[PDB]
Amino acid sequence: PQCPPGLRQYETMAVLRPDMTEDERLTLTQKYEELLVAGGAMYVEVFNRGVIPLAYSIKRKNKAGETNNYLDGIYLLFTYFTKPESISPLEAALVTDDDVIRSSSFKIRKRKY
Amino acid sequence: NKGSVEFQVFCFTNKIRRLTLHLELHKKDYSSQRGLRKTLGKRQRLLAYLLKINGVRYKELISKLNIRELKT
Amino acid sequence: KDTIADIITCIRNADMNRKGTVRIVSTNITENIVKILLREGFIENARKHQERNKYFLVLTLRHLNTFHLKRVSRPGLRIYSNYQRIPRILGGMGIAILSTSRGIMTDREARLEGIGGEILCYIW
Amino acid sequence: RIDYRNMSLISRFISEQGKILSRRVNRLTLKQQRLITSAIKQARILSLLPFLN
Amino acid sequence: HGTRKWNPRMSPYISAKCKGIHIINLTRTARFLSEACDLVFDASSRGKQFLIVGTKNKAADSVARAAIRARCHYVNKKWLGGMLTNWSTTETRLHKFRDLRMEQTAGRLARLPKRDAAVVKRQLSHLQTYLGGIKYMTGLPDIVIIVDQQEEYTALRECITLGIPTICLIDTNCNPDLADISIPANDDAIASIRLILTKLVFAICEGRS
RNA sequence: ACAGGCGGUGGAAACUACCAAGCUGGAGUACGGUAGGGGCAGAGGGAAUUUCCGGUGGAGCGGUGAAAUGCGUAGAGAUCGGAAAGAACACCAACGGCGAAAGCACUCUGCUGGGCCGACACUGACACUGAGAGACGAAAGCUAGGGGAGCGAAUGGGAUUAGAUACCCCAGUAGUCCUAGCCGUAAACGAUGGAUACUAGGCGCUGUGCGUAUCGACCCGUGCAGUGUUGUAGCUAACGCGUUAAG
Ligand SMILES: [Mg+2]
Ligand SMILES: [Mg+2]
Ligand SMILES: [Mg+2]
Ligand SMILES: [Mg+2]
Ligand SMILES: [Mg+2]
Ligand SMILES: [Mg+2]
Ligand SMILES: [Mg+2]
Ligand SMILES: [Mg+2]
Ligand SMILES: [Mg+2]
Question: Coil, strand or helix: which one is E22?
Answer without folding.
Answer: strand
